[PDB]
Design a protein around this ligand. Structure first.
Ligand SMILES: CC(C)(C)c1cc(Cn2cnc3c(Cl)nc(N)nc32)on1
Length: 207
């Protein structure tokens, strides 16, 4: 079954602003998603220090960047702590409320400071018409979150191949944003914004 939810009003407003504002510096989305992955890897690494069984779902802590010109997608994969169903439906949005209000006040400021308000994920909509999030947290099931904005998102149990643990952010890119599938563009962005991330970042090459 697919459940459909309304974004909190302030998050719907933020998403419309990101989608509708003229802003050429769209590449900051990738640094924000890599930062989220790094934070998630930090969290599971920390938790493993007192409960080693937390890594039974996979010992490798890494980030993969996977472009697909065929699917017109850029996928950011991590083996971090992952998100629970409650994370996806309510709890992360609840935390994002205060940051969203503060960010939207500041804009009224540059869109590139979005990460300093804890809502960097939504910068994905600078480049993506739809975002699909596949995520697996220890002691919860594997879920697919999805939204093309417009005020709603869906959550379902994922039937795709299992992940073990972590999060895959699948960016279904807008037609005019296919530069983010080019190897040299991704390398340039990571080198400029994410050169000091403390986990291996592997940029997959297309076949
Ligand atoms: C999808 C939606 C619920 C809207 C979201 C996603 C984020 C950012 N984020 C929070 N926890 C995360 C983990 Cl565990 N991993 C990664 N990669 N990202 C994470 O915030 N909200």
């Amino acid at each position: 079954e697919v459940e459909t939810f309304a974004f909190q009003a302030e998050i719907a407003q933020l998403m419309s602003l990101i989608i509708n504002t003229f802003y050429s510096n769209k590449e900051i989305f990738l640094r924000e998603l890599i930062s989220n992955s790094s934070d998630a890897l930090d969290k599971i690494r920390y938790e493993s220090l007192t409960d080693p069984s937390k890594l039974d779902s996979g010992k490798e802590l890494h980030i993969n960047l996977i472009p697909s010109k065929q699917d017109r997608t850029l996928t950011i994969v991590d083996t971090g702590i992952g998100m629970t169903k409650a994370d996806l439906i309510n709890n992360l949005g609840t935390i994002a409320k205060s940051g969203t209000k503060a960010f939207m006040e500041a804009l009224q400021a540059d869109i590139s400071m979005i990460g300093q308000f804890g809502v960097g994920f939504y910068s994905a909509y600078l480049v993506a018409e739809k975002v699909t999030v596949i995520t697996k947290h220890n002691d919860d099931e594997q879920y697919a979150w999805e939204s093309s904005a417009g005020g709603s998102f869906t959550v379902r149990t994922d039937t795709g191949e299992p992940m073990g643990r972590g999060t895959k952010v699948i960016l279904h890119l807008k037609e005019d944003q296919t530069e983010y599938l080019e190897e040299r563009r991704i390398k340039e962005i990571v080198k400029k914004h994410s050169q000091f991330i403390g986990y291996p970042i592997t940029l997959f090459v297309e076949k």
